[PDB]
Design an enzyme around this catalytic site. Structure first.
Site, short mmCIF file in Angstrom:
data_model
loop_
_atom_site.label_atom_id
_atom_site.label_comp_id
_atom_site.label_asym_id
_atom_site.label_seq_id
_atom_site.Cartn_x
_atom_site.Cartn_y
_atom_site.Cartn_z
N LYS A 100 -3.20 0.84 6.78
CA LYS A 100 -3.08 -0.54 7.23
C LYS A 100 -3.59 -0.69 8.66
O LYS A 100 -3.79 0.30 9.37
CB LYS A 100 -1.63 -0.99 7.11
CG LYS A 100 -1.16 -1.21 5.68
CD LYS A 100 0.05 -2.13 5.65
CE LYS A 100 0.47 -2.46 4.23
NZ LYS A 100 1.04 -1.27 3.55
N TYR B 155 -3.44 -9.24 -3.26
CA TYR B 155 -1.99 -9.34 -3.42
C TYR B 155 -1.64 -10.47 -4.39
O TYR B 155 -0.95 -11.43 -4.05
CB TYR B 155 -1.33 -9.55 -2.06
CG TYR B 155 -1.17 -8.28 -1.26
CD1 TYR B 155 -0.43 -7.22 -1.76
CD2 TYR B 155 -1.74 -8.15 -0.01
CE1 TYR B 155 -0.27 -6.05 -1.03
CE2 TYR B 155 -1.59 -6.99 0.73
CZ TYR B 155 -0.86 -5.95 0.21
OH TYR B 155 -0.71 -4.79 0.94
N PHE C 284 7.62 -13.51 1.48
CA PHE C 284 6.98 -12.69 2.49
C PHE C 284 5.46 -12.77 2.45
O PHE C 284 4.80 -12.14 3.29
CB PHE C 284 7.43 -11.23 2.36
CG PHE C 284 7.14 -10.62 1.02
CD1 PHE C 284 5.86 -10.21 0.67
CD2 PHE C 284 8.16 -10.45 0.10
CE1 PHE C 284 5.61 -9.65 -0.56
CE2 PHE C 284 7.91 -9.88 -1.14
CZ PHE C 284 6.63 -9.49 -1.47
N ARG D 101 3.69 8.82 -3.57
CA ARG D 101 4.90 8.05 -3.30
C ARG D 101 5.91 8.88 -2.51
O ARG D 101 6.56 8.37 -1.59
CB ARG D 101 5.52 7.54 -4.60
CG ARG D 101 4.59 6.68 -5.44
CD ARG D 101 4.32 5.34 -4.79
NE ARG D 101 5.49 4.47 -4.83
CZ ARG D 101 5.46 3.17 -4.53
NH1 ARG D 101 4.33 2.59 -4.17
NH2 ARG D 101 6.58 2.45 -4.59
N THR E 285 10.10 2.89 1.37
CA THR E 285 9.28 1.73 1.70
C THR E 285 9.73 1.02 2.97
O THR E 285 8.97 0.18 3.48
CB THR E 285 9.29 0.74 0.54
OG1 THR E 285 8.51 -0.42 0.89
CG2 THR E 285 10.71 0.31 0.21
N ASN F 168 4.45 -1.01 7.56
CA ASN F 168 4.75 0.34 7.10
C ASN F 168 3.57 1.30 7.23
O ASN F 168 3.71 2.48 6.89
CB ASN F 168 5.25 0.30 5.65
CG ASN F 168 4.21 -0.22 4.68
OD1 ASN F 168 3.05 -0.45 5.04
ND2 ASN F 168 4.61 -0.41 3.43
N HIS G 105 -0.22 1.84 2.33
CA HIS G 105 0.02 1.17 1.06
C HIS G 105 -0.45 2.07 -0.07
O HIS G 105 -1.58 2.58 -0.02
CB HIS G 105 -0.68 -0.19 0.99
CG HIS G 105 -0.60 -0.85 -0.35
ND1 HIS G 105 -1.36 -0.46 -1.43
CD2 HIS G 105 0.17 -1.88 -0.79
CE1 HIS G 105 -1.08 -1.22 -2.47
NE2 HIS G 105 -0.15 -2.09 -2.11
N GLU H 178 -6.69 -1.17 -9.07
CA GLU H 178 -7.01 -1.33 -7.66
C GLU H 178 -8.23 -0.49 -7.27
O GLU H 178 -9.05 -0.93 -6.46
CB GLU H 178 -5.81 -0.96 -6.80
CG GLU H 178 -6.02 -1.45 -5.41
CD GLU H 178 -6.36 -2.93 -5.43
OE1 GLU H 178 -5.71 -3.68 -6.19
OE2 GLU H 178 -7.29 -3.33 -4.72
#
Lengths: 249, 51, 201, 115, 249
Positions: C9, C49, C57, C85, C91, C115, C118, C129
């Site tokens: 990010k 998204y 959010f 993960r 998260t 965070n 992703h 994706e």
């Protein structure tokens, strides 16, 4: 890429780290390294460092090897050392024994320029000064001899040789991008499996040049240029490691 | 011989030419010119006699 | 051997920690199949998204994701999704620091939404994706190559345009040589097709 | 463009649509309403996806707003200087003196720092 | 072995032939070569040469290319040339059309400093000085661009790329071991196929360094060090051509 380190490259890139050699010595090295290399028969011979002595004259030390083998799970280099006061005549730097090296270990302070001085130890022992020089040089060499990771590879007959088609160290501002010369290329033993605070690395991403300073032996400097795959190392100073390193950190 | 007469040179006023003989005597009162003034060729003079 | 999608990010890129993240990713057994540095636009991020459509959010999430360039990566490993993960950790960064202190969220995250990484959730989302950011990256030769699915694919999308093209060609009947007919039908397909428009200047 | 950039000549700085910067010299005395052309720095050709047009710089000079009388004297001396093969020795000595005075490293105004 | 000639190694090996640049300009080069290499999209930008002038402000000229293809039986590089007076700030050299390319070869002389100079020919033709500079650089590059043979190779999609397994040229004193850069790798065209007396080769066989000097263009030097496998080329002096080669030889 490169076959052997270039002395002028080492002096140009490691000048900011205070690792310099005088002008007369520069020209004398330029003209005299090839002569000794040819006389000895060594495929490679280069300036290893400059140990400073008490009076004006200094000890320039060069090392050379013919071919590096892979024995006992390590990259064994059969090296031969030469010393000089001026950069013109290169005399030989003889190997020393074990107990004599232990006695070298208890000689401290700056050594004197004259290669005929004898130090006194304890029943009294007479220690030649060239023995102390060799002890210090071999200690520094066996401690810190840096080479970028996977820049050498094995081959048929099992002799470690330069890797001609070498991509270049990725993530070069980290210790994993460098290793010891005597570490096998295949193994993942790199410059990160030693003590946690004995090395420092500075990096310039635009110029793409990395400098590695040894903290255990403060005078050992290494550079690696990313744009042109050239790397080189130099030692400047007396051969004493700072045993009081922890308080420095 | 040809290159020496044309090219070898000395700063202007550094010497004094003897009126009788060709010999040049070092000038005691010569005050140096400092900086980019020594790039103008008017501040230099020939040191050997013209061939 | 599976593979998953993962993006660094803008917060971990503005702080210059992207390279360290890649090195850590590679140190744990992953293999970066393809990477690309890219700056999303508002429309592209909103389409990205899509699942959290009309959520509470969503405004801040789409505003943060288009504040700077991000890195997009495909990571390959036998257990790539679950392993990523686990490595990526919990998260929530505040929960992460307490629970797993040595995790990417704890080390580089700063906020519930920032965070710093992703990842994907399930293999279907991962494949979707990867296709979204790497349209030309091959993969999944089992679900796509399936006689029932393949017949459905040809019928639903390729067949409607092809039947009209083969009819027009049967009407016109060009030269009996292969190349002229092939060029004619290809030009017809590239000329009038359902999804694309016609270009005039 | 400033007037002295037009006469003396400088390098224009342009950031292209592609992420490459570009520095183009001024090759002569830029005429009023003249232009400059940098080939291969325009939009791509719709027919061939390799060749492109040529970037066109249209020059609009920015003349100085104020000039003093001594500045005008210097400009007239610059715009009527005799050719270098017609100059006296006094002219050459005067020019050398003026150049050494204008580029004086501590009391000359060849290079100043903005306040 | 090498992938791009250095600036430091070239300036060091060609110092004896007068191919030197000012020290302040050397530092400015060291800083401002990567800046131009990143501003422009180029991936290999080296120093081409230094042309003299009626002023002290010589023209330093650098050359860089992105793609290097094989078109119509010739290895063609999409070169881009930049110039500067000091090593700090570079400008670009736009190519010239054929009418000017023929009206610029008749202007013999030494170039002046301001690149806003107009020469006059015969009606009067007003030609800019940067056009003349580009013409001279193009002519010299056409006549003199020298690289060791087999240093390049052809891959898929017909791109000339460095031969990463190049083991150097045997007999580095013979002109058959050097070639123009725009000769395709398979073709057996070398500098021998040029006029016999145009090129001079002096080979120090002990230190293993060869120098090739152009006599048709007297200011072009090329060095090739075989032991370290580094080759470079520079041009110092103006770009005028030695027409009367027959009388001098």
């Amino acid at each position: 890429v490169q076959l052997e380190p270039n002395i002028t490259l080492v002096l140009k890139h490691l000048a900011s780290c205070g690792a310099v050699v005088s002008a007369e010595q520069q020209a004398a090295l330029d003209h005299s390294i090839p002569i000794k290399r040819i006389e000895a028969g060594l495929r490679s011979l280069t300036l290893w460092g400059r140990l400073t002595t008490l009076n004006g004259k200094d000890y320039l030390v060069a090392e050379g090897y013919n071919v590096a083998s892979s024995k006992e799970g390590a990259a064994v280099y059969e090296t031969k050392y030469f010393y000089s006061q001026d950069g013109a005549r290169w005399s030989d730097l003889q190997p020393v024994d074990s107990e004599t090296a232990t006695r070298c270990a208890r000689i401290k302070g700056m050594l004197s320029g004259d290669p005929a001085k004898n130090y006194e130890l304890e029943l009294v022992f007479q220690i030649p000064e060239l023995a102390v020089l060799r002890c210090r040089v071999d200690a520094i060499a066996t401690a810190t001899s840096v080479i970028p990771t996977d820049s050498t590879i094995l081959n048929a007959a099992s002799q470690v040789v330069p890797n001609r088609l070498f991509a270049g160290a990725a993530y070069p501002e980290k210790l994993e991008s460098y290793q010891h010369r005597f570490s096998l290329p295949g193994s993942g033993v790199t410059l990160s499996q030693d003590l946690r605070g004995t090395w420092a690395v500075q990096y310039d991403a635009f110029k793409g040049v990395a400098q590695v300073r040894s903290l255990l032996f403060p005078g050992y400097f290494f550079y690696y240029a990313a744009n042109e795959l050239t790397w080189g190392s130099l030692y400047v100073g007396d051969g004493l490691r700072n045993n009081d390193l922890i308080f420095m950190l | 011989a040809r290159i020496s007469a044309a090219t070898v040179c000395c700063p202007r006023g550094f010497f004094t030419a003897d009126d009788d003989s060709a010999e040049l005597s070092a000038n005691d009162e010569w005050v140096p010119l400092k900086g980019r003034e020594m790039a103008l060729p008017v501040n230099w003079s020939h040191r050997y006699a013209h061939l | 051997l599976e593979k998953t999608f993962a993006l660094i990010k803008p917060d971990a890129v503005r702080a210059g920690k992207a390279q360290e993240i890649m090195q850590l990713i590679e140190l744990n057994g992953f293999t970066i199949i393809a990477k690309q540095k890219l700056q999303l636009t508002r429309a592209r991020a909103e389409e990205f998204y899509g699942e959290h459509k009309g959520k509470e959010f969503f405004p801040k999430l789409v505003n943060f994701m288009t504040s700077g360039p991000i890195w997009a990566l495909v990571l390959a490993k036998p257990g790539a999704i679950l392993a990523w993960r686990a490595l990526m950790g919990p998260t929530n960064v505040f929960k992460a620091r307490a629970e797993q202190p040595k995790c990417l969220r704890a080390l580089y995250g700063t906020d519930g939404t920032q965070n710093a990484t992703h990842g994907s959730d399930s293999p279907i989302s991962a494949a979707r994706e990867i296709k979204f950011f790497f349209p030309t990256l091959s993969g999944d030769p089992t679900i796509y190559a399936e006689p029932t699915a393949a017949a459905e694919y040809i019928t639903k999308r390729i067949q409607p345009a092809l039947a009209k093209a083969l009819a027009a060609l049967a009407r016109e009947k060009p030269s009996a040589d292969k190349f002229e007919a092939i060029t004619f039908v290809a030009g017809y397909l590239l000329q009038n097709n359902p999804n694309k428009p016609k270009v005039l200047m | 463009l400033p007037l002295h950039h037009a006469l003396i000549g400088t390098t224009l700085d342009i950031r292209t649509l592609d992420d490459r910067d570009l520095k183009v010299p001024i090759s002569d005395i830029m005429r009023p309403g003249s232009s400059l052309t940098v080939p291969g720095e325009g939009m791509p050709l719709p027919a061939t996806p390799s060749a492109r047009g040529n970037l066109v710089i249209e020059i609009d000079l920015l003349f100085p707003t104020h000039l003093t009388e001594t500045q005008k004297m210097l400009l007239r001396s610059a715009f009527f200087l005799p050719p270098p093969t017609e100059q006296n020795e006094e002219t050459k000595k005067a020019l050398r003196d003026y150049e050494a005075a204008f580029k004086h490293d501590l009391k000359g105004w060849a290079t100043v720092f903005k306040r």
